[PDB]
Design a binder for these strands. Structure first.
Ligand SMILES: [Ca+2]
Ligand SMILES: [Mg+2]
Ligand SMILES: [Mg+2]
Ligand SMILES: [Mg+2]
Ligand SMILES: [Mg+2]
Length: 341
DNA sequence: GGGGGAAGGATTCG
DNA sequence: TTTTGAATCCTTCCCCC
């Protein structure tokens, strides 16, 4: 199996440079203004110029500005990015029927029927980079290898505007030298729990008792790692189907007065139904984020698809259930639909 | 014992 | 003034064979 991976570079920012070239070279930060107060909200992503000086995904727009008072600040235009993306993705489908769109900016291509070796792949990666650079003027990073994981790993080692290949040999190496927290799907909480066991590389998972690992990071993640450690990882590139759609919004002011929260819940639903677009959900969850930033949600499954009228009524019940079962005030309120027919 | 599914906190990645 | 927001992942609880 041969996997070619495409990761668009600093995507939201880049699309913004493409829409306004007079931005190339300058620091650009794509934000998500929450609305509570002047510049309240986080940073979605910034081009590399802005990353150098410490501005990056996650930090507050408030901090961001103290550091780069002149960097160009722009509101996240998700819609636009999503359309530009789809176009890019299509260009990809012209290189393999087996395509796994993973995110608005990542895609996996099983090209084990279009090349015979990594060289022929490399040349394909180059072809793909340039074809995307012409058509959409967007630079990307390619990662090629034996399975979706390492190909991604490859691409991280190269971005931006790069292209790398990890041969079955470098895999044996990485399995031995690569920091485990750098392995896809392994976040901070699991990275930590792994260092707390002395496990720092993929290999290390092989020298530990299984029921021990499983008890610390769960059965699924336990198996997932062991399988990589053994280079026994092969997972088909499959069409990924979104399994749930939702929306959650930050209220102007914390509260727990049912009638004050409703309007938001309802807008959250409307925006969610628009997004559902012909998909009929059989499950609804109302999600609340309390003042201390904790998350509390209550859902319910129906033996039939849910109409917008039903969502409205059921969501209020679930919201009440929340207020009853928790005393904290709500900061952000939202809804989530799933289990489509 | 375990199928199978419903719920809700947990974790990941932005 | 904090820390936006979207979606799956994991785990437990529960009914019934
Ligand atoms: Ca990217
Ligand atoms: Mg991404
Ligand atoms: Mg990590
Ligand atoms: Mg909690
Ligand atoms: Mg529970």
């Amino acid at each position: 199996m041969i996997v070619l991976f495409v990761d668009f570079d600093y995507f939201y920012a880049q699309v913004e440079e493409v829409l306004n070239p007079s931005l190339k070279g300058k620091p650009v930060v794509v934000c998500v203004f929450s609305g509570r107060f002047e510049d309240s909200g986080a940073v979605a992503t910034a081009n590399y110029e802005a990353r150098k000086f410490g501005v990056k995904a996650g930090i507050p727009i408030v901090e961001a500005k103290k550091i780069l008072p002149n960097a160009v600040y722009l509101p996240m235009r998700k819609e636009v990015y999503q359309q530009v993306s789809s176009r890019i993705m299509n260009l990809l489908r012209e290189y393999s029927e087996k395509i796994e769109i993973a995110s608005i900016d990542e895609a996996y291509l099983d090209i084990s029927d279009k090349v015979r070796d990594y060289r022929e792949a490399y040349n394909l990666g180059l072809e793909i980079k340039n074809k995307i650079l012409e058509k959409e003027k967007i630079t990307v990073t390619v990662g090629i290898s034996k399975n979706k994981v390492f190909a991604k790993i490859a691409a991280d080692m190269a971005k931006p505007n790069g292209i790398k290949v990890i041969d079955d040999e470098e895999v044996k190496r990485l399995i031995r030298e690569l920091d485990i927290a750098d392995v896809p799907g392994i976040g901070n909480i699991t990275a930590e729990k792994l260092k707390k066991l002395g496990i720092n590389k993929l290999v290390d998972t092989l020298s530990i008792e299984f029921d021990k690992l499983k008890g610390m990071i769960g059965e699924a993640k336990a198996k997932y790692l062991i399988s990589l450690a053994r280079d026994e990882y092969n997972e088909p590139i499959r069409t990924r189907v979104r399994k749930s759609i939702g929306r959650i919004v930050t209220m102007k002011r914390n509260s727990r007065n049912l009638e004050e929260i409703k309007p938001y819940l309802f807008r959250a639903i409307e925006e969610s139904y628009y997004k559902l677009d012909k998909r009929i959900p059989k499950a609804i969850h109302v999600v609340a984020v309390t003042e201390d930033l904790d998350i509390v949600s209550r859902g319910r499954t129906f033996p039939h698809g849910i109409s917008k009228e039903t969502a409205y009524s059921e969501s209020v019940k679930l919201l009440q259930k929340i207020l009853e079962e928790d005393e904290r005030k709500i900061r952000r309120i939202g809804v989530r639909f799933s289990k489509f027919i």
